[PDB]
Curated annotation (Swiss-Prot), chain A:
Coiled-coil regions listed: none
Residue stretches spanning the membrane: none
Places the protein is found: Cytoplasm; Nucleus
Gene behind the chain: RPT3
Taxonomic superkingdom: Eukaryota
Signal peptide positions on this chain: none
Organism of provenance: Saccharomyces cerevisiae (strain ATCC 204508 / S288c) (Baker's yeast)
Protein modification: N-acetylated by NAT3.
Protein's name in the database: 26S proteasome regulatory subunit 6B homolog
Its job: The 26S proteasome is involved in the ATP-dependent degradation of ubiquitinated proteins. The regulatory (or ATPase) complex confers ATP dependency and substrate specificity to the 26S complex.
Family: Belongs to the AAA ATPase family.
From Swiss-Prot, chain B:
PTM summary: N-acetylated by NAT3.
Residue span relative to the full protein: 154 to 298 of 306
Record-stated family: Belongs to the peptidase M67A family.
Domain comment (free text): The JAMM motif is required for the deubiquitination and degradation of ubiquitinated substrates.
Record's function text: Component of the lid subcomplex of the 26S proteasome, a multiprotein complex involved in the ATP-dependent degradation of ubiquitinated proteins. RPN11 is the only catalytically active member of the lid and serves as the essential deubiquitinase of the proteasome.
Additional information: Present with 16400 molecules/cell in log phase SD medium.
UniProt-recorded name of the protein: Ubiquitin carboxyl-terminal hydrolase RPN11
UniProtKB/Swiss-Prot annotation, chain C:
Keyword check for Manganese: no
Additional remarks: Present with 4750 molecules/cell in log phase SD medium.
This protein's name: 26S proteasome regulatory subunit RPN2
Any Pfam family hit: PC_rep
An example Gene Ontology molecular-function term: ubiquitin protein ligase binding
One example of a Gene Ontology biological process annotation: regulation of protein catabolic process
Amino acid sequence: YFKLKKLEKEYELLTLQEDYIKDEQRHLKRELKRAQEEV
Amino acid sequence: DAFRLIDTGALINNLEPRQTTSNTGLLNKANIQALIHGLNRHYYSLNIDYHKTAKETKMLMNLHYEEKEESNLAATKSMVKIAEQYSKRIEEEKELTEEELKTRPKKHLSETADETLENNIVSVLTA
Amino acid sequence: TTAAPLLALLRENQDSVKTYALESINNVVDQLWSEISNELPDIEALYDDDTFSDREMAALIASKVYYNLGEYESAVKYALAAKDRFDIDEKSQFVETIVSKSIEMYVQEASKQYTKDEQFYTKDIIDPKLTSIFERMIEKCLKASELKLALGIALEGYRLDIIESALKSKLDQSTSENVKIINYLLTLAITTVTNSKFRSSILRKSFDFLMNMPNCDYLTLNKVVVNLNDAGLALQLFKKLKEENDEGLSAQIAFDLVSSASQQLLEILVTELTAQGYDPALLNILSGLPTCDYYNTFLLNNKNIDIGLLNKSKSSLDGKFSLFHTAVSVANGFMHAGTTDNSFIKANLPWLGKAQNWAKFTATASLGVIHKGNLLEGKKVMAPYLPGSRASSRFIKGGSLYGLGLIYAGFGRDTTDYLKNIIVENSGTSGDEDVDVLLHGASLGIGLAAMGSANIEVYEALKEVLYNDSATSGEAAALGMGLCMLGTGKPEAIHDMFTYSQETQHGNITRGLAVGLALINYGRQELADDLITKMLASDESLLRYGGAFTIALAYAGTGNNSAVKRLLHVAVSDSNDDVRRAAVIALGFVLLRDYTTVPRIVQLLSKSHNAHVRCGTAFALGIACAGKGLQSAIDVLDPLTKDPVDFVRQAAMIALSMILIQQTEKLNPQVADINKNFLSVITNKHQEGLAKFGACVAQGIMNAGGRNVTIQLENADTGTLDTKSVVGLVMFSQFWYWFPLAHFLSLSFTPTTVIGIRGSDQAIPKFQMNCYAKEDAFSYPRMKYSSKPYKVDNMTRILPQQSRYISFIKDDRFVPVRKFKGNNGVVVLRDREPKEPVALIETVRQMKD
């Protein structure tokens, strides 16, 4: 029972890293506009 | 960059004014960088900060139904030119295709497809 | 083979025909369920017929329509009308699913209805068909002699009837196994149960289970009391132990509740137990007065560090271009913490002359960390620095009051009336340069002395200071009210500090109120969402900055998946480099539950852009994993060390220093190259100024307290977090607004050693202890695997890895009680037949009185 609930928390840890990258990839395009135009 | 005189009162002979030292370093160019704490009288490094309120945020947002008329105004000129606009896009993609076949490039071909996408979906929005 | 012949006989009216047609479907199922879906509405129509008595067998097959179709939502609903026709022990493919599917339906109807009432399982709110099946699986697990599956399924169902009946019936007496089962459900309630209301009910029931048996583990008895934070069950433990008082019984729980209990919990045990009688020798121990005196001798004679380490680093830079003078006073306090060694200040006289009044602020306050643990000499040694004596500047008095609250923190109730009355007298009359500096230090003194203790007069005394619109005296006045709101606090101050923050045009006052909001909610978890939303909705960069600290403190320890998503959205939204940095620092406090998954999140943010954010990701490994350390976390901090950015290397040497505390060869081979880099930055003069701050701090962290203490936010005893340790580290990772926030790190110092105390003489005996800590396996540095045993007396340095195998010898006539729990802390022993004293360790108490 203890090891069964450990797998449920691992699915949330994979979701935290998955939802952040999907949001980061769209924000990287905003930093590219501040980069190539400024330099 | 800014430079401030010294009214003291926090300094007198030797003290440590200007709380919250953070952000960037000295930088600048040459002369005033060599001496900072040695001679603080007429020169020393500073930082620049800007404070805006809630009303000042939308003040610069006015760049983007007045502008709606200009959206359909550009569509009027392209309405008669819809045959001439796509004529130059298709003939350009044909010439870029032969250059890719004779390479045996994709950068110049992708730039033409991007302008075609903006001339299609936006033209559909007129209906 | 089609289902048409068997299903066509139900269109007529007969008693025998309707029986034979239904029973034939139960025999052949997997073949005929294809055509039953078309006849499904005709079969379910017979359930409402009162003259049809086969509905028990009909509902069993009707549930198999969606069960064979692949939809389990409707399969469990129609299977509840079978009554006795529903098999249990058959253990077939249909039984192992619908029963398990009913468990999921039992949980969905539980947590949603648990908010309204917890008794729904008794009443008709929940379908009794699901409850009856839920109880049959409980008795099935009892026959298998497994308490994990029987008691674990009731935790997610929110039912107190099975947990109390099943766990108590299995108690036998011996009791060592029953306590472990109780310890499991307390840890299982952290993972499975996401609600704090259900935990409060388990903590109360698990307490009375061990109170009926005379032999029980006393560490678990306090485990349910500290997490509940209630005085009802706390006083009940001392009632049974009144006549049961023993050397290693009543005195064993006194030292464990010093840092476990809050400020309000310690004041109740002293006042309430006074009327019923109490041991006069055990009085000051509950408050913690003598507790700090036990380690004054331990950190003195056992200190192997050399004083010349700070002299060589300080002599490198002096006079013109004065920076380290603020940082040297910080590094001086760590190494001399608890040893009461002032010789460094009296060593080089020109260092006091070159130190300015602003440098004397951290120089006079450095005595609070050095003399921390001695409450008698706190005001005696600092008397010339304390107010009332003529000095050369007001910063000397203001700098002394800041360090005055370090030693007296939590005990400042005696000095509270003295400090806050000066602020009231200086509130109406102000504007002078000497008045604002005097109150600026007084606000820092009243805050740290009253830190942790809720006081109404302290909150009201600092309210009128903000109305005068003074940023010098208003900045310290905002942080003083937040230190008293730790833990629960007053919810009325949430809306007051939030409203007055937007009406103030001062930057330091608005920032102080935003940071104070995070200190109001401590351990609230989802209960702090009301303040989190209001702070993130505002456009102020200061209010949005403190929003990440609220998530860090409330979700500290046990976290939640929804709290991490909020910290990740703020870093990608706000353009402030400081607010984005506070988001990655707050990720360390939510991961305190498991230190293994910490580097997995940090490694993704180490290679990203925004070097200001990369500076905060370095402390992410200096918060959670700093108490233990990992080899995988070292590679994450490698690119931050080679980063040419100045302030990134500042955060790298600090994080690498806390991980390498008490590390030597044959343990972490990388400690040699990293420790030499701390002195290389000081030696190299080509480095910039911003990169040399972390060099003098890192050398004082590893040597802090003579390597007799470590930096840890908590330890495992009752399964709780320290109030002053978690809040103190939030500032330790922040150098931007005010650099020497590391003075708050002194409250988080946890000495690591095993000190036995014999209750006969109320002193520390001397005897050997069999352990695996021999230097051939684990040792300590000087200026995994275990084979051979080891023996050493008390009052010796014991690493946190060495404290797990410590065992007391029973041939010396010393009866252990706590034995080894796998961590540090005082273990009070017992005595069987007292005759004559064996040995005694002479402490510094004999040299004074």
